[PDB]
Design a protein around this ligand. Structure first.
Ligand code: THP
Length: 129
């Protein structure tokens, strides 16, 4: 797979956070994870973690997998990196998201993420506490 550039578009004017990819604003959805919603346990902690990772990055990159690049809502489907650190993996490794939504065809980093889940679960972190 290939990492490609993007920049963070911060939330303003009642809009949501987005990434600018090829010079266009897009909502992205992280591949291979299920993240608690804001009203659920660890929802605020997952949002805060992601926001810190992306806001503090010098360089954001998006890495599409080999299958579909957008979902039925028009969201980009990608692995997102902040200064080389994968956000999808880091969230799962902290127990702030579960491996999920593994569609045949966009599963390149499934095993990496499952190992991070198993380590988060053994360490009884967050959702596994
Ligand atoms: C992560 C992911 C989600 N989706 C769709 C499946 C779910 O559809 P439904 O909206 O019908 O449940 C939805 C879950 O996203 P959220 O977890 O962001 O709500 O996004 C994909 O189609 N491909 C993906 O790779």
């Amino acid at each position: 797979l290939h990492k490609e550039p993007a920049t963070l578009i911060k939330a303003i004017d009642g809009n949501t956070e987005k990434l600018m990819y090829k010079g266009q604003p897009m909502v992205f959805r992280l591949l291979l994870v299920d993240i608690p919603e804001f009203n659920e346990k660890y929802g605020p902690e997952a949002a805060a973690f992601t926001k810190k990772m992306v806001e503090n990055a010098k360089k954001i990159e998006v890495e599409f997998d080999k299958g579909q690049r957008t979902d039925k809502y028009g969201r980009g489907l990608a692995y997102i990196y902040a200064d080389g650190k994968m956000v999808n993996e880091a969230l799962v490794r902290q127990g702030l998201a579960k491996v999920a939504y593994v569609y045949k065809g966009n599963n390149t980093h499934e095993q990496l993420l499952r190992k991070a889940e198993a380590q988060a679960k053994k360490e009884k972190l967050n959702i596994w506490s």
